[PDB]
């Protein structure tokens, strides 16, 4: 018996492979880099073993088959479908987006059938069960009827409470579904997520040995947010013209003073790889902290429960 | 962030009073009627004797030999007790009672057993002949739900 | 009407004065340095004005009196008590520790009625509500009584469950209060805080113009953690013998590969001041952000809930 | 950083007890008085009979034919029950009661109806003549708030 790896940790590693492979590095060199940039041993250890099979000439799909407890049949088949069709790059991008959506969805049920499914049944009916069970403590409560009425009339009068229960359900479903003119002012710009991804990708390609300009040309093709893609094309154009990396960044609001000042050190130090790796880890942890997706649950959780109980009493 | 134990427990005692409200309100009325019945009785004696001694039902309180004034046989929830041809009716006051029983009344009437009589207790009745009474149908009768099991008699009970 | 300054910003500045003054720099030169190293204008601006009074010959306590909205009566009196008794150095160290405890205590109530208060009520009773909910689903559960007992006996038998709920509460309170044989292995070593303080102190004395070795001799007397003091005495001893600063650091785990690589660039560039200032501000921001403070919550969160449910079950 | 759910919910149950304190404290007193009333009654029998048989109110317990000793008609909250000229007064003990009702008392007295009597229940009273009593005004009367709706009678109630 062996377990997989965390949702976070699959995420980081699938993202960073998709990024390196779409950069045109050799698959074995992609594998080496993410292993060598890893913080947990179990990841660095596996990825050396996956790479060891790839250097014997096996496909990535067949190399991941050595860890079926970590990469399930659906993951390998996605890889292998990409390898068979000549689309390994775009299926890894798909898998990275998949792993990101999976981790975010995990944090965000749990915060405040897997665990998400069992916890989501369990939260969706907790209250409405409470409710039915206070309303089953005997007869002649607030709002009931006597049991001798005809059933249809008894059930229709309680319709109030059947309704307050369904509304309670709809609410906890909404919290679980949501929760996992200046025209340019209205466009979605770069977020925290998109800066964290950028920084990880660049930290990744620099630590591997790619120059800054080669890493930026790859990244400018793999950036999801259009306004950031436009930002990064401008940063790369500025750097390729001979402007200093920290100065192309300083023109764009999305990079704080600390980010620019830290990058500006990294330029003079030949340590940009790592400046970016520490920036990226800082951002990835700020991202996963960012907490209102769990407090607003609980607001609607007990607020609806209490609204039911109040409802019939009155 | 915290304080819901004080808020719910103050609101469960509030709703507990609302559930305990109708129980105390019919237990209560049912209690105020049980007295109209006690005030009605104990006047059976006068009426019984009058009938057995004369063979005619006492026309009114004075005939029966009781507070010549109906209003003189009142109580806390009872506004009075009148004897009308052997039938003794008790009226519920207007102050100090339930709400759906005030100004409402019941009757006690008897029947010749021949050598003795038997008494009945129920909703208001009028005497027709010396051995027959009938529902004083009019709308002021104390509702069946407020009457004891011992006072559910119908106008034609024998 | 004028406001004070942030808890963070009093902190940084009281620390860095205590550090410079305990170094034996002149008080006016201490004042100049922290002003000249400041990032906010309002701080650099005041501290020039406090220094302007000190160069007219006034005490530091009387110079801070020009900003009574920033340095309260209790702060000045501590300074003035230090100045009157010949202990200005040790009362500034006390004030720096005070300001650090004040900022940390501020972040840490406020963090998460705001959102923290609403989320903390909401987490503290979630479980104990679930619990009362499953135990109110009728009669004749595990461990109950029949309702016809006398109330006092019924309530006393359940005392088990009333107790398992309170314990659940105490636990989630502990996680919210805390959280905002090899004998040497057991000693508290250097933390993030202690590295951030060190780096700020050194960034501070180098930017002012002190050499590396003069700054290390002061710092080795003002380091609070004993194991770090022992580390820093070894770093200073190595440097004074002619070993290169990055090489004395590289022997000690508390300095990452990059801190060392960055310091190693600073040695060859004559920019150790700039390097240390940016290292320090990176660390100070990592400190105030700060992942095990959230995983251990959840351990006690569901672990206590489950302990209750099992408790009556049995 | 965290633990406020335990701190607020321990402090809402604390304030819940403070709000539930005066409710249980008058419900409680009102309960201890309802007994002084039950101990006072049931002694109406002796007093009624004594009056109807002799036409004079019993001067004291012995006359009424009850525990010759007032203190022998005590209870948990009742320190005693004395019959003084047909008036039966019940005293509240000093231990085991509310706080503003101990050592306090009420009275039950009757009135000649002529052939029968009617009883009253209320705050302490003294008998003046065979058909008149008056407030035993002195400061030890159980406060109106603690008396049932059925025991709000005034010295001149008829």
- For residue D68, the distance in angstroms to the closest alpha carbon of chain B comes to 32
Tell me which DSSP letter residue B96 carries. Answer: S
10 Å CB burial of residue C197 (0-12, 13-18, 19+) is: buried
CB proximity C308 to D under 8 Å: no
The Cα A37–Cα A46 span in angstroms is 13
Give CA angle at D69 (D68, D72), nearest 5°. 115
The Cα A275–Cα D111 span in angstroms is 103
| Out of C112, C265, C289, closest to residue A286 by CB | C289
Both tokens of D56, joined, read: 């004079």
Task: Give residues with Cβ within 8 angstroms of C147, minimum separation 6.
Answer: C139, C154
Chain center to CA of A243: 34
The Cα C101–Cα C110 span in angstroms is 14
List of chain B residues whose C-beta atoms are within 8 Å of the C-beta of residue D149: 96
Interface test with D, best of B1, B6, B43 (most D CBs within 10 A): B6
Place of tokens 């700039």: C274
| Out of B8, B19, B23, closest to residue A142 by CB | B19
CA-nearest of A180, A178, A174, A169 to A122 is A169
Place of tokens 């046989």: B73
Tell me which DSSP letter residue D142 carries. Answer: P
The Cα B19–Cα B22 span in angstroms is 7
The Cα D59–Cα D23 span in angstroms is 40
10 Å CB burial of residue C294 (0-12, 13-18, 19+) is: middle
Place of tokens 């030999």: B65
Asked whether the CA dihedral A192, A194, A195, A199 is positive or negative, the reply is positive
Task: Give residues with Cβ within 8 angstroms of C137, minimum separation 6.
Answer: A129, A130, A133
Task: Give residues with Cβ within 8 angstroms of C221, minimum separation 6.
Answer: C22
Angle between helices C272-289 and C192-208 (to 10 degrees): 150
The Cα B104–Cα B121 span in angstroms is 15
Collapsed DSSP state (helix, strand, coil) of residue D37: helix
Query: Residue B72's closest chain D neighbor by CA?
Result: D113
Task: Write the DSSP string, chain C.
Answer: ------HHHHHHHHHHHHHHHHTT--HHHHHHHHHHT-SSHHHHHHHHHHHHHHHTT--HHHHHTT-TTTS-HHHHHHHHHHHHHT-HHHHHHHHHHHHHHHHHHHHHHH----HHHHHHHHHHTTHHHHHHHHTTS-SS-SS---TTS-HHHHHHHHHHHHHHHHHHHHHHHHHHHS----GGGGS----HHHHHHHHHHHHHHHHHT--HHHHHHHHHHH--SHHHHHHHHHHHHHHHTT--THHHHHTSTTS-HHHHHHHHHHHHHT-HHHHHHHHHHHHHHHHHH--TTTHHHHHHHHHHHHHHHHHHH-
- For residue C233, the distance in angstroms to the closest alpha carbon of chain B comes to 49
- For residue C120, the distance in angstroms to the closest alpha carbon of chain B comes to 5
Both tokens of B116, joined, read: 């003795």
Task: Write the DSSP string, B130-157.
Answer: TTEEEE--SS-BPPGGGS-GGG-B-TT-
Collapsed DSSP state (helix, strand, coil) of residue A28: helix
Chain center to CA of C17: 18
Task: Give residues with Cβ within 8 angstroms of A182, minimum separation 6.
Answer: none
Angle between helices A272-289 and A257-269 (to 10 degrees): 160
Collapsed DSSP state (helix, strand, coil) of residue A33: helix
| Out of C122, C128, C174, closest to residue D3 by CB | C174
Strands B117-122 and B105-112: antiparallel
CB proximity A294 to B under 8 Å: no
Which chains have 3+ CB pairs within 8 A of A? B, C
For D14, what's the count of Cα atoms within 13 Å in the CB-facing half-sphere? 8
Strands in B87-92's sheet, in edge-to-edge order, are B78-84, B87-92, B105-112, B117-122
List of chain C residues whose C-beta atoms are within 8 Å of the C-beta of residue B2: 120-121, 124-125
Q: Which residues of A22-38 are buried (b: 16+ CB within 10 A; e: fewer)?
A: bbebebbebbbbbbebb
Give CA angle at C48 (C44, C50), nearest 5°. 115
The Cα B66–Cα C97 span in angstroms is 98
Other CB atoms closer than 10 Å to residue A250's CB: what's the count?
16
CB proximity B11 to A under 8 Å: yes
Collapsed DSSP state (helix, strand, coil) of residue A302: helix
- List C-alpha distances in Å: A230 to A196, A219, A224, A226, A227: 17, 12, 11, 6, 5
The Cα D147–Cα D98 span in angstroms is 13
CA-nearest of A198, A249, A260, A257 to A225 is A198
Asked whether the CA dihedral C264, C267, C270, C273 is positive or negative, the reply is positive
Task: Give residues with Cβ within 8 angstroms of D67, minimum separation 6.
Answer: D61, D73
Range of the domain at D41: 2-158
CB A172 within 8 A of CB A165: no
CA-nearest of D23, D22, A140 to B21 is A140
Touching status, chains B and C (3+ beta-carbon pairs under 8 Å): yes
CB proximity B4 to A under 8 Å: yes
The Cα B138–Cα B142 span in angstroms is 11
List of chain C residues whose C-beta atoms are within 8 Å of the C-beta of residue A256: none
Secondary structure E strands in chain D: 78-84, 87-92, 105-112, 117-122, 125-129, 132-135
B15–A313 C-beta distance less than 8 A: yes
List of chain D residues whose C-beta atoms are within 8 Å of the C-beta of residue C175: 2-3
10 Å CB burial of residue D30 (0-12, 13-18, 19+) is: middle
The Cα C109–Cα C178 span in angstroms is 11
10 Å CB burial of residue B10 (0-12, 13-18, 19+) is: middle
Q: What is the 3-state secondary structure (H, E, C) of A100-141?
A: HHHHHHHHHHHCCCCHHHHHHHHHHCCHHHHHHHHCCCCCCC
The domain spanning residue D79 has which CATH number? 3.30.700.10
Length of chain C: 314
CB C24 within 8 A of CB C205: no
Other CB atoms closer than 10 Å to residue A162's CB: what's the count?
13
CB D151 within 8 A of CB D142: no
Secondary structure E strands in A49-101: none
CA-nearest of B137, B108, B143, B140 to B122 is B108
Tell me which DSSP letter residue D149 carries. Answer: G
Task: Give residues with Cβ within 8 angstroms of A9, minimum separation 6.
Answer: A40, A43
Both tokens of C308, joined, read: 């209750």
Breaks (C-N over 2.5 A) in chain C follow: 112, 180, 290
- Residue B125 φ then ψ, to 5°: -140, 160
CB D145 within 8 A of CB D28: no
Q: Which residues of A77-100 are buried (b: 16+ CB within 10 A; e: fewer)?
A: ebbbebbeeeebeebbbebbebbb
Collapsed DSSP state (helix, strand, coil) of residue D92: strand
CB proximity C106 to B under 8 Å: no
10 Å CB burial of residue B87 (0-12, 13-18, 19+) is: buried
- List C-alpha distances in Å: C8 to C18, C176, C197, C204: 16, 22, 13, 17
Both tokens of A8, joined, read: 């976070």
Helix or strand (DSSP H, E) at B57 = none
Long-range (24+ apart) CB contacts under 8 A made by B47-51 are B47/B83, B47/B86, B47/B88, B47/B110, B48/B110, B48/B117, B50/B86, B51/B86, B51/B110, B51/B112, B51/B117
Collapsed DSSP state (helix, strand, coil) of residue D12: helix
Place of tokens 């909250």: D77
CB A201 within 8 A of CB A217: no
Strands B132-135 and B125-129: antiparallel
The Cα A303–Cα B46 span in angstroms is 67
The Cα A277–Cα C82 span in angstroms is 45
Tell me which DSSP letter residue D97 carries. Answer: S
Length of chain A: 314
CA-nearest of D75, D98, D89 to D146 is D98
CB proximity A241 to B under 8 Å: no
Task: Write the DSSP string, D55-76.
Answer: SS--SSHHHHTS-SSGGGG--S
10 Å CB burial of residue B17 (0-12, 13-18, 19+) is: exposed
Other CB atoms closer than 10 Å to residue A169's CB: what's the count?
14
CA-nearest of C105, C103, C121, C124 to C113 is C121
Place of tokens 């060891």: A52
The Cα A302–Cα B81 span in angstroms is 58
List of chain B residues whose C-beta atoms are within 8 Å of the C-beta of residue D8: 1-3
Tell me which DSSP letter residue A184 carries. Answer: G
For B119, what's the count of Cα atoms within 13 Å in the CB-facing half-sphere? 20
Both tokens of A241, joined, read: 């013209």
The Cα B121–Cα B109 span in angstroms is 7
CB A19 within 8 A of CB A37: no
Breaks (C-N over 2.5 A) in chain A follow: 112, 180, 290
The Cα A83–Cα A266 span in angstroms is 37
Asked whether the CA dihedral A237, A239, A244, A246 is positive or negative, the reply is positive
Number of folded domains that form chain D: 1
Which residues on adjacent β-strands are paired with residue C283?
none
Query: What count of CB pairs under 8 Å joins B to C?
Result: 16
Collapsed DSSP state (helix, strand, coil) of residue A243: coil
Which residues on adjacent β-strands are paired with residue D81?
D90
- Residue D120 φ then ψ, to 5°: -125, 160
The Cα C59–Cα C84 span in angstroms is 10
- Residue C288 φ then ψ, to 5°: -75, -25
CB A110 within 8 A of CB C301: no
């Amino acid at each position: 018996g062996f377990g997989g790896v965390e949702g976070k940790d699959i995420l980081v590693f699938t993202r960073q492979f998709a990024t390196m492979i779409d950069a045109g590095l050799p698959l074995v060199q992609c594998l080496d880099i993410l292993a060598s940039q890893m913080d947990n041993p179990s990841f660095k250890k596996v990825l050396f073993a996956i790479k060891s099979k790839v250097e014997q000439g096996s496909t990535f799909a067949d190399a991941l088959k050595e860890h079926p407890k970590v990469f399930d049949e659906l993951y390998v088949q996605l890889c292998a479908a990409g390898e068979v069709g000549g689309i390994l790059d775009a299926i890894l991008n798909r898998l990275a987006a998949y792993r990101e959506k999976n981790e975010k969805l995990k944090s965000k049920v749990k915060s405040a059938l897997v665990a998400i499914g069992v916890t989501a049944v369990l939260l969706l009916k907790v209250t409405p069960v409470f409710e039915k069970m206070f309303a089953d403590f005997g007869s002649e409560l607030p709002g009931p009827t006597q049991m001798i009425v005809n059933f249809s009339h008894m059930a229709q009068e309680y319709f109030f409470h059947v309704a307050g229960s369904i509304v309670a359900v709809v609410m906890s479903f909404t919290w679980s579904y949501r929760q996992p003119l200046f025209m340019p002012v209205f466009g979605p710009v770069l977020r925290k997520v998109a800066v964290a991804r950028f920084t990880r990708t660049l930290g990744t390609m620099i630590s591997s040995g790619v120059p800054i300009l080669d890493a930026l040309d790859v990244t400018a093709k793999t950036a999801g947010n259009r306004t950031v893609e436009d930002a990064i094309i401008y940063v790369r154009g500025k750097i390729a013209e001979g402007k200093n990396i920290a100065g192309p960044l300083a023109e764009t609001k999305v990079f704080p003073s600390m980010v620019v000042q830290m990058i500006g050190v990294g330029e003079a130090t030949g340590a940009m790889d790592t400046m970016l790796n520490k920036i990226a880890d800082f951002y990835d942890d700020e991202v996963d902290a960012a907490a209102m997706i769990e407090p607003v649950l609980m607001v609607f959780l007990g607020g609806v429960v209490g609204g039911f109980l109040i409802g019939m009493y009155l | 962030f915290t304080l819901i134990e004080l808020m719910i427990v103050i609101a469960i005692v509030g709703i507990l009073a609302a559930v305990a409200l109708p129980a105390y309100q019919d237990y209560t009325a049912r209690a105020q009627v049980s007295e109209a019945i006690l005030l009605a009785e104990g006047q059976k004696s006068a009426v019984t004797e009058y009938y057995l001694n004369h063979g005619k039902w006492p026309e009114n309180n004075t005939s029966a030999g009781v507070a010549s004034s109906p209003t003189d046989i009142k109580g806390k929830y009872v506004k009075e007790v009148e004897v009308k041809n052997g039938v003794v009716t008790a009226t519920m006051l207007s102050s100090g009672v339930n709400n759906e029983i005030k100004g409402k009344k019941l009757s006690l009437w008897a029947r010749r057993e021949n050598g003795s009589v038997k008494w009945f207790c129920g909703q208001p009745v009028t005497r027709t002949d010396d051995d027959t009474v009938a529902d004083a149908k009019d709308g002021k009768e104390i509702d069946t739900k407020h009457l004891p099991s011992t006072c559910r008699d119908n106008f034609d009970a024998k």
